[PDB]
Design a protein around this motif. Sequence first.
Motif, PDB file in Angstrom:
ATOM      1  N   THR A   4       0.842  -1.236   0.000  1.00  0.00           N
ATOM      2  CA  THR A   4       0.000   0.000   0.000  1.00  0.00           C
ATOM      3  C   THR A   4       0.864   1.269   0.000  1.00  0.00           C
ATOM      4  O   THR A   4       0.347   2.365  -0.064  1.00  0.00           O
ATOM      5  N   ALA A   5       2.164   1.129   0.087  1.00  0.00           N
ATOM      6  CA  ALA A   5       3.060   2.325   0.101  1.00  0.00           C
ATOM      7  C   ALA A   5       2.929   3.124  -1.201  1.00  0.00           C
ATOM      8  O   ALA A   5       3.753   3.012  -2.090  1.00  0.00           O
ATOM      9  N   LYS A   6       1.910   3.934  -1.314  1.00  0.00           N
ATOM     10  CA  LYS A   6       1.734   4.745  -2.553  1.00  0.00           C
ATOM     11  C   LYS A   6       2.693   5.939  -2.519  1.00  0.00           C
ATOM     12  O   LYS A   6       2.277   7.079  -2.477  1.00  0.00           O
TER      13      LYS A   6
ATOM     14  N   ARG B  40       1.880   4.729  -6.517  1.00  0.00           N
ATOM     15  CA  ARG B  40       1.788   3.358  -7.115  1.00  0.00           C
ATOM     16  C   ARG B  40       1.844   2.264  -6.052  1.00  0.00           C
ATOM     17  O   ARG B  40       2.635   2.319  -5.129  1.00  0.00           O
ATOM     18  N   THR B  41       1.047   1.239  -6.220  1.00  0.00           N
ATOM     19  CA  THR B  41       1.088   0.093  -5.271  1.00  0.00           C
ATOM     20  C   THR B  41       2.251  -0.796  -5.701  1.00  0.00           C
ATOM     21  O   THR B  41       2.344  -1.175  -6.855  1.00  0.00           O
ATOM     22  N   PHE B  42       3.157  -1.098  -4.813  1.00  0.00           N
ATOM     23  CA  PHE B  42       4.334  -1.923  -5.213  1.00  0.00           C
ATOM     24  C   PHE B  42       4.042  -3.416  -5.055  1.00  0.00           C
ATOM     25  O   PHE B  42       3.191  -3.815  -4.283  1.00  0.00           O
TER      26      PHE B  42
ATOM     27  N   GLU C 102      11.307  -3.605  -4.452  1.00  0.00           N
ATOM     28  CA  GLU C 102      11.089  -2.490  -5.423  1.00  0.00           C
ATOM     29  C   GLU C 102      10.712  -1.229  -4.657  1.00  0.00           C
ATOM     30  O   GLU C 102      11.309  -0.185  -4.841  1.00  0.00           O
ATOM     31  N   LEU C 103       9.752  -1.322  -3.767  1.00  0.00           N
ATOM     32  CA  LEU C 103       9.373  -0.125  -2.951  1.00  0.00           C
ATOM     33  C   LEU C 103      10.626   0.406  -2.238  1.00  0.00           C
ATOM     34  O   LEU C 103      10.739   1.579  -1.939  1.00  0.00           O
TER      35      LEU C 103
END
Length: 28
Positions: A4-6, A10-12, A17-18
């Motif tokens: 949920t780290a937008k 963007r949703t990872f 990647e996040l």
Amino acid sequence: QQYTAKIKGRTFRNEKELRDFIEKFKGR
């Protein structure tokens, strides 16, 4: 659903990647 780290907007799929986004986000 995955991450949920937008950060920029963007949703990872995985934390890696996040985590590799802030590296390429000029913020680290």
